[PDB]
């Protein structure tokens, strides 16, 4: 019965905020749901009370928007919709430049953030 | 041993019962955001510290104008951003005549912020 109320998280909220119990037994799990603007990153969306009365979790929701990958020297990075999770951008080269690497990239779940499936290609020769 | 509180680029003191001329170290005065700015922080105070200087964190920031849209057969250039004070420029392609302004400023408009000049046209 070592854990107190769970911390407030930037990415998730508790499902069922009733309970009102101020102390939680070692081992109890609380189910969480992503706050708006965040996407599910892991299967397990829980907080667990461990032996030392701290809540243990990984970051299981992440901010949904990727950043713009930058300028494509000798070519073009085109937004099709936005830069949000799931969305895709396309790369093309101008003139007669040969594009090496990927022609598209999707904003996808990665590490402890969100990111591009493929990097910016190059436009050479 | 502080003197009267300053008006800052982004905020001015609440209560204009003017310059009671000296303030003891530790006094805090509430400020209000000047137009074109929004509250950025809970704390809107200046405090007079040991060295008789007013100390603050920055509690107001620039309001943001919106992007004005596409300029048919011309180009809209962000020089800085679209924030209060910033300027954008307009150009037309080829040999088109630009009618209207070649620039626009993000400026105070009544209770928000807005563009001094609208999108030009590119003609003939």
């Amino acid at each position: 019965s070592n854990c107190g109320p769970p911390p407030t998280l930037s990415f998730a909220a508790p499902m069922d905020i009733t309970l009102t119990e101020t102390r939680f037994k070692t081992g109890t799990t609380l189910k969480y749901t992503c706050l708006p603007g965040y996407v599910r990153s892991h299967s397990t969306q829980t907080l667990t009370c461990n032996s030392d009365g701290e809540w243990v979790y990984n970051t299981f929701c992440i901010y949904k928007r990727c950043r713009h990958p930058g300028e494509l020297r000798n070519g073009q990075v085109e937004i099709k919709t936005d830069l949000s999770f799931g969305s895709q951008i396309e790369f093309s080269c101008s003139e007669g430049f040969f594009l090496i690497g990927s022609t598209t990239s999707r904003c996808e779940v990665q590490d402890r953030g969100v990111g591009w499936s493929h990097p910016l290609p190059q436009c050479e020769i | 041993n502080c003197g009267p509180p300053p008006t800052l680029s982004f905020a001015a003191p609440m209560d204009i019962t003017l310059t009671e001329t000296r303030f003891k170290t530790g006094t805090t005065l509430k400020y209000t955001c000047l137009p074109g700015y929004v509250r950025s922080h809970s704390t809107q105070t200046l405090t007079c510290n040991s060295d008789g200087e007013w100390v603050y964190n920055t509690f107001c920031i620039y309001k943001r104008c919106r992007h004005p849209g596409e300029l048919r057969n011309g180009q809209v250039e962000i020089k800085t951003d679209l924030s209060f004070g910033s300027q954008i420029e307009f150009s037309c392609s080829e040999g088109f005549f630009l009618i209207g302004s070649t620039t626009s400023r993000c400026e105070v408009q009544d209770r928000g912020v807005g563009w001094s000049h609208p999108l030009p046209q590119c003609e003939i």
């Binding site: 407030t8 998280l9 | 250039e77 962000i78």
Partner: peptide, 28 residues
């Protein structure tokens, strides 16, 4: 031309932080 990309990133980072900021106040 890169300024648009810079602004998008500026706004995207702000949006995330403003959302974090709201949760911090909610916690209080």
């Amino acid at each position: 031309i890169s300024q648009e990309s810079k602004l998008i990133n500026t706004l995207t980072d702000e949006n995330e932080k403003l959302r974090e900021e709201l949760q911090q106040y909610y916690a209080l």
